Design a binder for this molecule. Structure first.
Ligand SMILES: Nc1ncnc2c1ncn2[C@@H]1O[C@H](COP(=O)(O)OP(=O)(O)OP(=O)(O)O)[C@@H](O)[C@H]1O
Ligand SMILES: [Mg+2]
Length: 247
């Protein structure tokens, strides 16, 4: 019932940030304390594990506006992040491989969280990874998408991470990601309520704590975890074969 709240970031370096995630996920052993990580990324585009960089983004537009190109451990679509986006991930013990339940429980915690801020949201309905919005892995505010999520599961452990749009540049996001309006399909938490990043963070902290019945206490990353992260970074996340999609 005791948990770890990690306010671990790496702005300026999206690739190292993703490395931390896989690091806390891979070092984790069945029975450890649940982990809740909050973090942000500066202007960058993150694609899923099975994606092909040159199939969702124009490497040129990103070379022009200084958008970092990073690829994550989990599948799913391509997203645009900037400091207006509040990313967070949960790592806990797992006794099965049921993906549907993880997303259902996590989305439940997020809904309870935004309620606290007076924002009534709901999870998407469709079971289609290809469609941009209204997926069961998304959280909707009315008809607009405000949060996207992906995850992975292995024997004894599961990972779930999300990206919520608090005050992100919805135009820019639309411009960088190819789909085929999108702009008209997403929205920021602040379109509904005037709240800061921390307020949304503190809201989610209570939400996940109350929903999951886990007392998350601010903690720091461990040497073991930090080492593995540097490891994952140096040998994968900081390489082109991985970020392009060849590794
Ligand atoms: N920072 C963001 N947070 C939430 N949704 C976003 C963000 N940036 C863009 N989007 C919208 O969310 C979509 C994310 O891709 P997709 O719908 O395939 O799954 P996802 O699970 O939300 O991806 P993530 O898990 O967001 O990489 C984009 O195509 C876009 O329409
Ligand atoms: Mg999603």
């Amino acid at each position: 019932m005791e948990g770890r709240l990690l306010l671990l970031e790496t702005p300026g370096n999206t690739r190292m940030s993703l490395a931390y995630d896989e690091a806390i996920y891979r070092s984790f052993q069945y029975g450890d304390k649940p982990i809740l990580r909050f973090y942000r990324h500066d202007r960058s585009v993150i694609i899923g594990y099975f994606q092909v960089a040159e199939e969702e983004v124009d490497l040129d537009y990103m070379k022009k506006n200084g958008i970092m190109l990073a690829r994550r451990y989990t599948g799913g679509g391509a997203v645009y992040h900037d400091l207006g986006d509040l990313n967070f991930s949960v790592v806990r013990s797992s006794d099965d491989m049921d993906i549907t339940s993880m997303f259902r429980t996590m989305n439940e915690a997020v809904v309870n969280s935004l309620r606290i801020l007076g924002l009534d949201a709901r999870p998407g309905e469709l079971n289609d990874v290809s469609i941009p919005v209204n997926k069961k892995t998304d959280i909707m505010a009315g008809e607009k998408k405000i949060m996207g999520a992906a995850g992975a599961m292995r024997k004894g452990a599961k990972l779930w991470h999300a990206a919520m749009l608090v005050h992100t540049d919805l135009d820019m996001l639309s411009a960088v990601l190819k789909v085929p309006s999108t702009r008209e399909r997403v929205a920021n938490v602040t379109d509904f309520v005037d709240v800061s990043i921390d307020e949304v963070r503190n809201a989610l902290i209570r939400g996940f704590s109350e929903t999951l019945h886990i007392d998350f206490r601010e903690d720091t990353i461990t040497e073991k975890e930090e080492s593995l992260a540097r490891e994952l970074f140096d040998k994968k996340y900081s390489t082109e074969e991985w970020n392009m999609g060849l590794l």
